Swiss-Prot record, chain A:
Superkingdom: Viruses
Compartments in which it is found: Virion
Record's function text: Forms the portal vertex of the capsid. This portal plays critical roles in head assembly, genome packaging, neck/tail attachment, and genome ejection. Procapsid assembly may initiate with a nucleation complex composed of portal and scaffolding proteins. The portal protein multimerizes as a single ring-shaped homododecamer arranged around a central channel. Switches upon genome packaging from an asymmetrical conformation in the procapsid (PC-portal) to a symmetrical ring in the mature capsid (MV-portal). This change of conformation may serve as a signal for headful packaging.
Organism annotation: Salmonella phage P22 (Bacteriophage P22)
Subunit architecture: Homododecamer. Interacts with the terminase large subunit; this interaction allows the packaging of viral DNA. Interacts (via C-terminus) with the head-to-tail adapter protein gp4; this interaction participates in the head completion. Interacts with the scaffolding protein; this interaction initiates procapsid assembly, thereby ensuring incorporation of only one portal ring per capsid. Interacts with the capsid protein.
Designated name of the protein: Portal protein
Family: Belongs to the p22likevirus portal protein family.
Curated annotation (Swiss-Prot), chain B:
Organism: Salmonella phage P22
GO MF terms held by the record: hydrolase activity
Keyword field contains Hydrolase: yes
Keywords, sorted A to Z: Degradation of host cell envelope components during virus entry, Degradation of host peptidoglycans during virus entry, Hydrolase, Late protein, Lyase, Viral genome ejection through host cell envelope, Viral penetration into host cytoplasm, Viral short tail ejection system, Virion, Virus entry into host cell
Protein name: Head-to-tail adapter protein gp4
UniProt key word Ribosomal protein: no
Job of this protein: Tail protein that binds the portal ring and functions as a head completion protein. 12 copies of gp4 form a structural ring at the bottom of the portal ring. Together with gp10 and gp26, gp4 is required for stabilization of the condensed DNA within the capsid; perhaps by plugging the hole through which the DNA enters. Plays a role in ejection of the bacteriophage DNA into the host cell at the initiation of infection. Functions as an exolysin that catalyzes the cleavage of the glycosidic bonds between N-acetylmuramic acid and N-acetylglucosamine residues in peptidoglycans.
InterPro entries cross-referenced by the UniProt entry: Gp4_sf, Tail_accessory_Gp4
Domain notes: The N-terminus changes its conformation when transitioning from the preassembly state to the postassembly state.
A Pfam family hit: P22_Tail-4
Protein localization: Virion
Length: 48, 152
C-alpha cells in the first residue's frame, strides 16, 4: 500500500536551540605555564 | 446435488408448497410447469440485475435450445435451497395459495445468505482523494508526493 505518513517535527527546534547555544560560546585551548617555570613559557606554543 | 435443472427447482418448489410431488396421486400439467420455469427465469433476471445484482452463477436459457426446462441451472450447491424457496413463494399465488411462514422465513434467510459474500466483496474503500499528499514518510527516498500507488 502507501497510506499517509506525515512528519510533524517537534524535536528539531530543540536540536537547533541546543546547537545555537553551544555555538554562541566558542571554546579553544589555552596554554598556561607550569608552576616554577618562566612566566612566559607558553607564549610560543600558544602563538603557534 | 440431486437438483440439477430448472425443472428440478420447479418440482422442489411445488413439493414444498404441497401442490405436487413424487408421492401425490395428481400432478401439474406441463404447461403449468413451463409457466413456473418462466417465473423462475423472470425472478432470476430481476435478481441478477444485468450484473449489478445478486451473483449466483445462474445460466440463462436461450431460445434456440428449445426446452428451458432441463437446462442446468448452474447454481452452486449452497444456492439451491434459497432459489427454490423463493420460487415457491413467487408461484404460490397461481394456485390460490399463500406460502407458509416457514417458507417465507427460509426464503428471506436464503436471499440474505446468497448476497452475503457479494456484499463483503463490494464493501471496498475508494482510493485517496485528488488533493491529498502522501506525507514526508513516503515522499523521502523516491520523491513521490502525490501518487498513492494503487498497487495494493
Amino acid at each position: 500500500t502507501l497510506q499517509y505518513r506525515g512528519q510533524f517535527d517537534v524535536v528539531r527546534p530543540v536540536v537547533r536551540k541546543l546547537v545555537s547555544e553551544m555555538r554562541q560560546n566558542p571554546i579553544d585551548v589555552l596554554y598556561r605555564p607550569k608552576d616554577g617555570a618562566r612566566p612566559d613559557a607558553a607564549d610560543v606554543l600558544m602563538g603557534m | 446435488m440431486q437438483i440439477k435443472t430448472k425443472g428440478d427447482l420447479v418440482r422442489a418448489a411445488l413439493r414444498k408448497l404441497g401442490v405436487a410431488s413424487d408421492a401425490t396421486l395428481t400432478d401439474v400439467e406441463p404447461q403449468s410447469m413451463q409457466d413456473a420455469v418462466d417465473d423462475l427465469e423472470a425472478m432470476m433476471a430481476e435478481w441478477y440485475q444485468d450484473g449489478k445484482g445478486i451473483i449466483t452463477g445462474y445460466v440463462f436459457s436461450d431460445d434456440e435450445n428449445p426446452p428451458a426446462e432441463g437446462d442446468d441451472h448452474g447454481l452452486r450447491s449452497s444456492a439451491v435451497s434459497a432459489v427454490f424457496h423463493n420460487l415457491a413463494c413467487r408461484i404460490a399465488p397461481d394456485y390460490a395459495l399463500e406460502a407458509t411462514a416457514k417458507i417465507i422465513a427460509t426464503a428471506k434467510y436464503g436471499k440474505e445468505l446468497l448476497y452475503k459474500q457479494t456484499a463483503i466483496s463490494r464493501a471496498k474503500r475508494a482510493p485517496y482523494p485528488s488533493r491529498m499528499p502522501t506525507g514526508s514518510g513516503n515522499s523521502f527516498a523516491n520523491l513521490n508526493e502525490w501518487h498513492y500507488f494503487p498497487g495494493e
